Amino acid sequence: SERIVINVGGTRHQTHRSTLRTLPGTRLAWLAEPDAHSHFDYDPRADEFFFDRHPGVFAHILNYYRTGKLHCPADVCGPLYEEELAFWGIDETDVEPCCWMTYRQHRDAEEALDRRWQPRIWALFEDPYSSRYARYVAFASLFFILVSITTFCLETHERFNPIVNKTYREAETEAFLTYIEGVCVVWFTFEFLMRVIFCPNKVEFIKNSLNIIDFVAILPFYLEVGLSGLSSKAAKDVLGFLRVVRFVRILRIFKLTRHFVGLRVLGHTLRASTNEFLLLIIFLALGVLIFATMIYYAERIGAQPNDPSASEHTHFKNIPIGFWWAVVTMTTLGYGDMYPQTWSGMLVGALCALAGVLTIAMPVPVIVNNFGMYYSLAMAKQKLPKKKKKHIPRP
Amino acid sequence: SERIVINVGGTRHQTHRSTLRTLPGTRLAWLAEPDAHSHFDYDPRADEFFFDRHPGVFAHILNYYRTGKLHCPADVCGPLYEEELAFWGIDETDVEPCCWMTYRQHRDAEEALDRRWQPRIWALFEDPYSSRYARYVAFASLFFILVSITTFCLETHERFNPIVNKTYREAETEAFLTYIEGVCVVWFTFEFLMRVIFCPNKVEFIKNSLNIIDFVAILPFYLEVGLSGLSSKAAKDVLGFLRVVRFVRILRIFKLTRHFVGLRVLGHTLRASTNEFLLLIIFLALGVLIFATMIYYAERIGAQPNDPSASEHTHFKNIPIGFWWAVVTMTTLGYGDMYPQTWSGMLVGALCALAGVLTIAMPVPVIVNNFGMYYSLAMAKQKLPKKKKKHIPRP
Amino acid sequence: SERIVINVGGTRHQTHRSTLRTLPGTRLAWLAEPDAHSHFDYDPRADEFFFDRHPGVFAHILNYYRTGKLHCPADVCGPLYEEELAFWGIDETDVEPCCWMTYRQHRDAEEALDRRWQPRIWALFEDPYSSRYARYVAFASLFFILVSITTFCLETHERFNPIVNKTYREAETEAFLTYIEGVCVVWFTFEFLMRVIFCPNKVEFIKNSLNIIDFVAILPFYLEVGLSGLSSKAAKDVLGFLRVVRFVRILRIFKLTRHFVGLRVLGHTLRASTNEFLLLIIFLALGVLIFATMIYYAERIGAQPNDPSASEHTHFKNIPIGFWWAVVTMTTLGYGDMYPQTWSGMLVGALCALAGVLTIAMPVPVIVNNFGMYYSLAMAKQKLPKKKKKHIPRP
Amino acid sequence: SERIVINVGGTRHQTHRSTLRTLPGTRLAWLAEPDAHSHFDYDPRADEFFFDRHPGVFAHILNYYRTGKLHCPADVCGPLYEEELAFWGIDETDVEPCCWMTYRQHRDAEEALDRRWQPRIWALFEDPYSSRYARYVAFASLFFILVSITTFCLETHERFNPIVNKTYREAETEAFLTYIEGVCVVWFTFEFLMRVIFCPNKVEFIKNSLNIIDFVAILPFYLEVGLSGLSSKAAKDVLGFLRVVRFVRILRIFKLTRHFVGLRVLGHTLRASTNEFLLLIIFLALGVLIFATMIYYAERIGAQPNDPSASEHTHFKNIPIGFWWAVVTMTTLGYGDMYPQTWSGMLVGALCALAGVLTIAMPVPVIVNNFGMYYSLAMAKQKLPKKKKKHIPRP
Numbered sequence A, B, C, D: 001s002e003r004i005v006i007n008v009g010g011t012r013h014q015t016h017r018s019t020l021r022t023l024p025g026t027r028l029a030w031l032a033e034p035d036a037h038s039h040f041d042y043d044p045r046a047d048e049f050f051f052d053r054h055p056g057v058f059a060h061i062l063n064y065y066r067t068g069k070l071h072c073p074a075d076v077c078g079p080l081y082e083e084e085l086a087f088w089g090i091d092e093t094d095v096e097p098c099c100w101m102t103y104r105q106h107r108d109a110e111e112a113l114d115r116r117w118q119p120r121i122w123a124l125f126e127d128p129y130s131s132r133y134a135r136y137v138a139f140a141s142l143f144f145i146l147v148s149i150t151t152f153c154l155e156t157h158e159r160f161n162p163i164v165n166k167t168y169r170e171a172e173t174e175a176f177l178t179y180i181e182g183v184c185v186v187w188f189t190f191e192f193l194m195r196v197i198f199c200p201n202k203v204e205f206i207k208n209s210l211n212i213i214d215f216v217a218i219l220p221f222y223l224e225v226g227l228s229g230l231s232s233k234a235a236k237d238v239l240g241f242l243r244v245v246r247f248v249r250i251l252r253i254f255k256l257t258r259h260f261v262g263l264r265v266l267g268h269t270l271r272a273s274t275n276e277f278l279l280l281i282i283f284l285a286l287g288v289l290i291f292a293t294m295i296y297y298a299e300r301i302g303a304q305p306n307d308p309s310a311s312e313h314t315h316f317k318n319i320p321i322g323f324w325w326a327v328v329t330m331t332t333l334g335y336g337d338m339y340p341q342t343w344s345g346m347l348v349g350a351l352c353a354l355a356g357v358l359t360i361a362m363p364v365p366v367i368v369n370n371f372g373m374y375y376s377l378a379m380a381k382q383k384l385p386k387k388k389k390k391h392i393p394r395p
Ligand SMILES: CC(C)CCC[C@@H](C)[C@H]1CC[C@H]2[C@@H]3CC=C4C[C@@H](OC(=O)CCC(=O)O)CC[C@]4(C)[C@H]3CC[C@]12C
Pocket: A208, A209, A210, A254, A255, A257, A258, A259, A263, A264, A265, A266, A267, C282, C283, C284, C286, C287, C290, C355, C356, C359
């Protein structure tokens, strides 16, 4: 009576029926029922029930039954213990805080990480290795995107933008850069039309940020061509705004870098560390405010109440400029454009540097470990390709 | 004789009675008593005592009995082993140093982390979500605190503080900033009176730093209003001191940020890493002193004993200024306002930079791991809300 | 029927024959064959098969058989579990991603880390301790390499390179430096000839980068001596190019430092962290481009469309210069030669500093842990010299 | 025959006699002897030998016997496994490299961390809490050491060192600083004589660096007093040298800080990380040399062979100055006194910054983990005071 022997994989586990009955509604409680002999795998010769499971972790499940707190064995994986808990009927949300992080770790990382020739036309954007012409198409896209970025950067330069005499010496960009941009634009509009020919799930295609960027980058050239026909002052202002807008041409490099695994892992880490990024932002804002105020007040210790020369011997004429000084000092950047020149200001600056180091190194390690785990998991996915299951399940 | 079998959860542990008698006053010693058969769960058919506990950790407790040193199994938690030690009667303070840190880790983290409508009136400060008007009240407090901080920072500026001609061109702050501050102050005094209406445990309410800050921030406006009535030079000096005191208005943001979990975790980490902060302070002070002296003496190698031009070609006219140079160089800030200009001074500066890196990276990682553990524990508290126990203890 | 008992090192493991038959072609499946009694170690008295292996890990192998996913026990080593898997016939490539990194860790680190007197002549380069004259030879090589590097650095100086009056005041290097270089060169050519005397595997000897460097460093002196005979303008240009080429003399220090274990470990880490170095390069390039464009556009907010004074109050005259500013700001270097001077530019600079910190601290920790593991393994190789096996294997 | 059952703590371990005989000279081999029944604890009823030890680790020792490689269980401590190996006769130096670091970790940390009233006189230096007058004596030493350091730093200042008119306006230090130094010196010489009164083990007392520092700091005042009597030019030169020597007064603070546990741990870490410090030094030297040469040659790309204006537009007039630039850039200090001004020089500077970050972060983490382990161990020594053994060993 009250003595029940559970044989888990050849290991005899002995406990009381009241111990099993403690947790109701589970398989071991059903074992603690007067019909378990007729409801389970029981042999009368040994008076023991046989379960074909892992005894090393069944020890810990029975220890949960005994004590009342569910822990996870540190000598097996979270997934292994989770499968055993699922079989034995235990809720995985009963696990103690001392086990929760190491238990829900691989699962959290995995959840963070995760018309005849119309397919032939849609293969234009597809993996360059997945076809023969796709390789050349992708290489041409690489070359044209790089050339467009280079032409943009050269357009911002001064050697290619001279001041020719005109209605005064107005500075105009050399026209060969515009011709190169025109060639790039005709290629890019060919590619965009070829990809728009095949647009399954047009809602998702429009919602796609990469194609949004491509259209936004292709608009300004045509808007400029149309604008130049009309010679008005408002046309000139819109032309200048279009020149500002042309910065979207450098965003086309994310199309090229989208396939890099480290970039995808970084995106996953950014999406999963929102709380830590907010923590860093709040720490920086509080430190910047406090240290800007402190340096403003410390750089005029002993100054007269209304002497205009109070702010004449300092870089800290106000608190908003101390904001910039404080961020530069806390990041250990130290440009040197503004620094304290008084003993109290130097004390405050030393405090600011140390506090910046500490409150930068608080959440950055959390984000770093998140990235490390996600990168390792993705790399394992790359090192271990899916293969034959090799395991034939029992019917 | 002398052979005793302990059956712990179906696992037969065999040891000598003298081995059990080694540690007196404990449950296993009582088992090694001639009456254990009449004092414990003993069956004569098998000549074994049955205990319904964890055998994997009972192995380690018996190993303590055998060898004489108590260790902790690395395949279970500190709390699990602590519960087993509490049941078996072993003192948790006998654990070896090789186990103490990993054993007393979750426990240390947990100890670091932890009149009809008078409640309706006291709900004014309560959680904004805990009521309907509290949401609007908290949003108004947010807006007014931010506006007061903005008005303070603008008051320190020069665009809003012109030099109008008066008894000379005295610089006076624009009065619209003072009017905005007055509106903020009337709102804040309404809030303070409404919270003072309900003040249970007035000793604790006075001791509360947040309300102390609120009163200290609300005093200066009224003190200024009263002071302006009396036109005296001492009144002007007290007015200037009140202008200095007005910096307490930026401390009201801690009322808003008090509810952030990362801020509470940071406070816990600061309170728990006092020794490491003192270690960092001592390291920095020793390095600053040594390197200031070394750079002072190295920047005049070969100089004449009393030539006044000895200090003319150097930024290091003395040692106290080398203190500032040394802290800036050791934090890898590098403002550049003062640097060595001699070969020996550059050697000393390289030494200073490397030593600063090392003696900054010594205790900062300890503080960082403390923060990481506390943050993870608090986050687990947030991921796993308290629910039904699900465990019905035996009577 | 269907009940089979496996005795692994005195521990009875019980499972179903269908469970063993799940994974075909392995030793346990052969055990689940009607002839296992005649094909294995079986005794009819106990109806159990005996295997003389580790039961604690056999539990996990049988758990793989039971559930269908292969994991690794966290309480043993990867090599231990690998040997057990090799014995039991399980493929090591079936291990789950949650186990792959901690399993294939030591193995990955190990794979990263790994004519009468003609031998007497070839002993000239050999380990200095491996002979008597080799010690003096290696010390002489040390002294001469250091002297050559010192003479190079002094040659670049201005105190040793005066402007003597000649066909004008042409600046010529003092001839005593050239004489010292000549002595060093005659020693080095003696050493090179002595090592070329014994050149086993001449293909590998030529492919050896150290000897390539030695020959490239010894060529310029003789090329200069031959060139000075011919007095032509093209001869002067080739002489200047040879002066540029003389920088290869500082590369001879890698011959001296080749034997340092930390340098070999660093080479292994560089070879094994190519993916992480590419990740760092891509992150830096993307950040530099984005932040250079952003600072260029933010430093002229509100500027006129074609006012030439738009770029007059800024260090950021174009985007390529912003590349340099961005790298300096992201590395937290902060030279201060160019910084933002506008509120929007300061916002962008704060963003740049924080983003640089984060995207520098993402892959650098991965590289750091790689180096740490490899260094620890190499140091263990140094702490535990190979000794007698002490284990006599059974025939 | 050939079948032997070992009963280790109630757990039956079964193996072959040849398996035990594999490792000769050990206790299990002696068990595999025809007399083991008469040489060990054997009962004929069960045909098993009983050992009262830990079965979980005996499994791993027997696995060493079986396979031939000795590993350490990850679910127990190094000290626990070491005690078991010592009992079973296995050499601890047979452990595999995959186990050596985690096994020899606590032991390595522990080895790194470790005439009537003549005792009354010698109590003058003793722990201030260990007596009543010692508290006041130590506080007086604190005050006098701090005052001496302050007087030194003030002596280096210019406000306290005016140029009074004398044989010209020679700058002489104010005499009140010298009087304060004289008071400090008389106190310190009293303390030194009182400590020299009781000098057990005079060889060790002389070898003690703290007392060496105290004597060296007390000499210069008396040497100055004696020197001032003789008015000679050589006397003035020796006086100036004594002024230089007076820097030893700041070294007296190590007497005060010697008792801090973090300082003792830092000393242990410095003594135990000599290899890593040499690694850091070699990495820095190689990087500094390479990048100084590279920046020197990159800052004059396209310059004429002998144009004196080649070095006129650069901070890098030679390679030795590039050494300083390179160290400043690699430490991410960035003073800004010298920076590249050419596109190639900026490329080289970006390379230098990244390489400096990487080769600083390579061995610094190793040193940091060493310090962390030693600090944790020392802190455990402080958290767990030695108490009653509580364990009565068997005779
Ligand atoms: C400081 C430097 C390193 C830039 C800042 C890094 C991140 C803020 C950005 C830059 C590049 C971005 C990546 C560029 C491209 C992609 C592909 C993108 O996938 C697609 O859009 C594919 C088509 C689709 O399904 O929409 C997913 C996000 C990701 C990884 C981005 C995630 C966010 C990243 C890492």
